[PDB]
Every structure is written in C-alpha cells, then in structure tokens.
Paper text:
Human leukocyte antigen (HLA) B∗39:06, B∗39:01, and B∗38:01 are closely related class I MHC allotypes that nonetheless show differential association with T1D. HLA class I molecules consist of an allele-specific heavy chain that is associated noncovalently with β2-microglobulin (β2m) and a presented peptide. The α1 and α2 domains of the heavy chain form the peptide-binding groove, which is characterized by six pockets designated A-F. In general, two well-conserved primary anchor residues occupy the B and F pockets and are located at position two and the C terminus of the peptide, respectively. Upon identifying a peptide that binds to both HLA-B∗39:06 and B∗39:01, we determined the respective X-ray structures of the two allotypes presenting this peptide to 1.7 Å resolution.
HLA-B∗39:01 differs from B∗39:06 only at residues 95 and 97, yet the two allotypes are differentially associated with T1D, with B∗39:06 conferring the greater risk. To understand this difference at a structural level, we sought to compare the two highly similar MHC molecules presenting an identical peptide. To this end, HLA-B∗39:01 was produced as a sc-pMHC, including the covalently linked NRVMLPKAA peptide for HLA-B∗39:06. The peptide was positioned as in the HLA-B∗39:06 structure, with the first eight amino acids (NRVMLPKA) occupying the peptide-binding groove. As F-pocket residue 95 differs between HLA-B∗39:06 (Trp) and B∗39:01 (Leu), we concentrated our structural comparison of the two allotypes on this region. In contrast, Leu95 in HLA-B∗39:01 allows the F pocket to more easily accommodate hydrophobic side chains larger than Ala, consistent with the preference for Leu at the C terminus of the bound peptide. The other dimorphic residue between HLA-B∗39:06 and B∗39:01, though not in the F pocket, is at position 97. In HLA-B∗39:01, Arg97 can hydrogen-bond to the carbonyl group of Pro6 of the NRV peptide, while Thr97 of B∗39:06 is unable to do so. Subsequently, using our cell-free competition assay, we found that the 8mer NRVMLPKA bound well to both HLA-B∗39:06 and B∗39:01, consistent with our structural findings. In this assay, NLRP2 320 to 328 bound to HLA-B∗39:06 with an IC50 of 14 nM and to B∗39:01 with an IC50 of 35 nM.
Author numbering: 323 to 335, 999 to 1099, 1999 to 2274
The structure:
C-alpha cells in the first residue's frame, strides 16, 4: 500500500548523467530445437529512460514482442526485459537491436547459443518530462522482494493501480481506489516537483528531465521492521534521502537543502516514519501471508560449468547459475581455494521471464590447469554454499 509523497521545493531567485545500456540476449531455458522456448533481450543500466528495443530474426524485426514495466536499480539506472516465444533452429540467427541517446547508431547483439525469512517491499516511481509533447509520463511499480505486484502508468487508456501478481487480486475495491488515488495525486506532486527542480538549476523548459523516487520497508523473519527507505533522485543522481533514523535528511547540494528545510518545517519525516513503521510493514506482512506459496519459497540455483577454449593455450571456465529466486546470489571463482577477484568476469543477474533469475561468472585459465579452479555459489535457497569444478 502506497504513501503520499511530499513535493520538492522551488528555489525562487546542473549535470546530466548518460549511461549506455548493457544488452544480454538469451533464452529462458537451455535451447533445444523443436521445443518452444522464450527469447529474452535484457537491457539494463541505462539512463535516460527512453529506449528502442527490437528482437530480430535473420535481420528482420519480430512483431508481437512484450516487455516488462519500467523500473530501476539501486544506482537509479533503468532496466527492461523484452521477450517473445520462439523455437530455435540450427541456422536461424537471432539478435537484439537497441537504440538510445548514447548510441550514434543502433547496436545489434546476436543470440550466442554457446529462504532467509527476511523480506522487502518497494515502490519505484519514474516521472519524465516531455517538453512539446504533453504532460510528463508517470510510471510506478510495486515489488515484494523480486516479485512485482502492482503497476501504474499515466499513459494507460484508464490510468489505475493495476494488479500484476495473482495474490494481490483478492484485495477489494477500497484498496484499488485508494492506491489509484495516491498514484494520481503522486503524479501531480511530481509534476510540480519537476517544474521546481528545473528552476532550481536554471534549466530550459525545452529539455526533458527525470524524477525518480523509491520508498519501502525491510522486515525480518518475525515481521519486525529492520529498515525503512525513502529516496529521491533527479536526472539519475541522488537528490535527497531520508536517513536510517527516519527522522533526518541527507541532501545532495544547495538546491536539495532548500527542499530539506521545507520538509523539516512541515515535519515530513515524522509522517514517513509513521507510514514506514505502520502501514508499510502491516501490508508487507499481509502480502507475505497471502502470497506465501510463492513469496516465501526460495528456488535454489541449478549450477554447472562450461569450457570454452581461447586457442590451444588458455580457456574460459564459465560458472552458470540458473532458475534461482530471489535474485541475490554470489558466484566466485577460486584457484587453490583463493578467490580470483581480479580476473573473474561477472554478468549482471538477468530475469528468466518466469520469476527466476540467471547469472554466470567466467575466468580465463591456463590450459591443463582447469582442475585447480572451483566455482563457489552462495544463495539463500542453499542450506550450504555449493562448490563445482569443470
């Protein structure tokens, strides 16, 4: 259940970070001809949020592709999963084509075939002005751990808080009407906040800017609050955050300090603390119980090692983790028991599309010395860490 958020203050009386997308193209399951599968293109770590993604087959654009609702990572960078059902063959070449302001031409990536008891609730808000093209777009999503359960999109035909997980559907009309109202109000707040922030930085009304907000709570196995959060970013960078004491603020610069003093005088922190200690944890406990059959089940990783020769003198060992939930995992390579921190390559953890996640860690090793390396796997669905070799 959401909370009403305060408005950023105007200043009366300067940097844009651009991150280019990471792109991973992969199937949900190990690919086997004839058997239907899912082709995924995961685009992550990008900023700003506008992006164009096509799945290609032998160079041709695939229609019907779906994608996830826009959300972002802890560093404020955005991620999206684009996916389609497909049946691979031997000589069909699949690819993902991505365009973004950081790319001087579209980038094509081919498909290369070769628990704990603690829980979190988060709401993620993205508001993007579009000068000359109407009002800002507002998209927000709610998660319990790594499971999305609501979305709101101000560009939907009828903007509403919408269910996105089966266990939320049982909530009555009061729940949907109330949280819709908070969204529609949080919409107009962020709209005035975008205007105020533009003025604080003397920015032109001709340019697009991004407001991102996150709040929610962490609970332990017994249901008690472990930590509350309420963060605010402008153009992909920290702006103002509620501190861990839920009673003071950290402001990034002199503009954000004006907002800090406004929220201090209005006692915003006290209102947020009341929400985080009460409503937030109370509804998180309720969701955990209503969805316990999926939300309180950790799926351990299915793990294996593959060998890919880099010529006849060295080779890549790749440690694979598949089908795990939640997403948090640690993969480490060791040589004679010592971690290969310097030489281990780690891809970003990526969604399978079926709620589970995937990751690999790779290290190049001297040929004939593969047997000295072991992959170490830590996941909350594993009673003990796993160790594997090639």
């Amino acid at each position: 259940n959401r909370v009403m958020l305060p408005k950023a203050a105007g200043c009366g009386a300067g940097s844009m970070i651009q991150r280019t997308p990471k792109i991973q193209v992969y199937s949900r399951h190990p690919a086997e001809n004839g058997k239907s599968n899912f082709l995924n293109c995961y685009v992550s770590g990008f900023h700003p949020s506008d992006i164009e993604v096509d799945l290609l087959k032998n160079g041709e654009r695939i229609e019907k592709v779906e994608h996830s609702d826009l959300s972002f990572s802890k560093d404020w960078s955005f991620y999206l999963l684009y996916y389609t059902e497909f049946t691979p063959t031997e000589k069909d070449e699949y690819a993902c084509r991505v365009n973004h302001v950081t790319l001087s031409q579209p980038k094509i990536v081919k498909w290369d075939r070769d628990g704990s008891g603690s829980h979190s609730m988060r709401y993620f808000y993205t508001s993007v002005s579009r000068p000359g093209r109407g009002e800002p777009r507002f998209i927000s999503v709610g998660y319990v751990d790594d499971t999305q359960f609501v979305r709101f999109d101000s560009d939907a035909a009828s903007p509403r808080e919408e269910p996105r997980a089966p266990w939320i559907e049982q909530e009555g009309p009061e729940y949907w009407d109330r949280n819709t109202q908070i969204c529609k109000t949080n919409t107009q707040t962020d709209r005035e906040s975008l205007r105020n922030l533009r003025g604080c930085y003397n920015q032109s009304e001709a340019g697009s800017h991004t407001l991102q907000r996150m709040y929610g709570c962490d609970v332990g196995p017994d249901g008690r609050l472990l930590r509350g959060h309420n963060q605010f970013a402008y153009d992909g960078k920290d702006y103002i955050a509620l501190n861990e004491d839920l009673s003071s603020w950290t402001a990034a610069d002199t503009a954000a300090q004006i907002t800090q003093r406004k929220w201090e005088a209005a006692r915003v922190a006290e209102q947020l603390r009341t929400y985080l200690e009460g409503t937030c944890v109370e509804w998180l406990r309720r969701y955990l119980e209503n969805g316990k059959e999926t939300l309180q089940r950790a799926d351990p990783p299915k793990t294996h090692v593959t060998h890919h020769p880099i010529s006849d003198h060295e080779a890549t060992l790749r440690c694979w983790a598949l089908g795990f939930y939640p997403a948090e995992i640690t993969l480490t390579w060791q040589r004679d028991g010592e971690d290969q921190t310097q030489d281990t390559e780690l891809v970003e953890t990526r969604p399978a599309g079926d709620r589970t996640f995937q990751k690999w860690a790779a290290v190049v090793v001297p040929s004939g010395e593969e047997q000295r390396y072991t992959c170490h796997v830590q996941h909350e669905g594993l009673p003990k860490p796993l160790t594997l070799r090639w």
